Amino acid sequence: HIWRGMIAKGGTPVCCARCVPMETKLPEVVNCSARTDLNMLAKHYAVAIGCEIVFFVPDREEDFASYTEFLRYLSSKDRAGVAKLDDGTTLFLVPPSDFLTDVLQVTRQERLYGVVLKLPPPA
């Protein structure tokens, strides 16, 4: 049982997608309801105590051109997308860039990363 669903931008479908791990349940639709500057995410990362990652791949070939285009839509502007898991956790949609190696310090891949940051809990 793999995750298979849709990605959307502002409620507007972008493509269908699947998901390989490196986590809670992904909704049927991962909607990118907003963007965040990579700088802003860098600040949350600096203090995070968990950083979980999945890769989103286009589901089928007909989803490729859109997936690719959605990557440039994010990386152009040095931004990341914002979506949610089922349980309300913030999920960031991070396209390929230096940010992946300099800040998250992970291997870089020409893939969209889903990223959840766990910040410190209260005392």
Residue numbers in the entry: 439 to 460, 465 to 565
Paper excerpt:
Recently, the split ends (SPEN) family of proteins was identified as RNA binding proteins that regulate alternative 3′-end cleavage and polyadenylation. They are characterized by possessing N-terminal RNA recognition motifs (RRMs) and a conserved SPEN paralog and ortholog C-terminal (SPOC) domain. The SPOC domain is believed to mediate protein-protein interactions and has diverse functions among SPEN family proteins, but the molecular mechanism of these functions is not well understood. FPA, a SPEN family protein in Arabidopsis thaliana and other plants, was found to regulate the 3′-end alternative cleavage and polyadenylation of the antisense RNAs of FLOWERING LOCUS (FLC), a flowering repressor gene.
The crystal structure of the SPOC domain of A. thaliana FPA has been determined at 2.7 Å resolution using the selenomethionyl single-wavelength anomalous dispersion method. The expression construct contained residues 433–565 of FPA, but only residues 439–460 and 465–565 are ordered in the crystal. The crystal structure of the FPA SPOC domain contains a seven-stranded, mostly anti-parallel β-barrel (β1-β7) and three helices (αA-αC). Helix αB covers one end of the barrel, while helices αA and αC are located next to each other at one side of the barrel. The other end of the β-barrel is covered by the loop connecting strands β2 and β3, which contains the disordered 461–464 segment. The center of the barrel is filled with hydrophobic side chains and is not accessible to the solvent. While the overall structure of the FPA SPOC domain is similar to that of the SHARP SPOC domain, there are noticeable differences in the positioning of the β-strands and the helices, and most of the loops have substantially different conformations as well. A doubly-phosphorylated peptide from SMRT is bound to the side of the barrel, near strands β1 and β3. Such a binding mode probably would not be possible in FPA, as the peptide would clash with the β1-β2 loop. An analysis of the SPOC domain indicates a large surface patch near strands β1, β3, β5 and β6 that is conserved among plant FPA homologs. The first surface patch is electropositive in nature, and residues Arg477 and Tyr515 are also conserved in the SHARP SPOC domain.
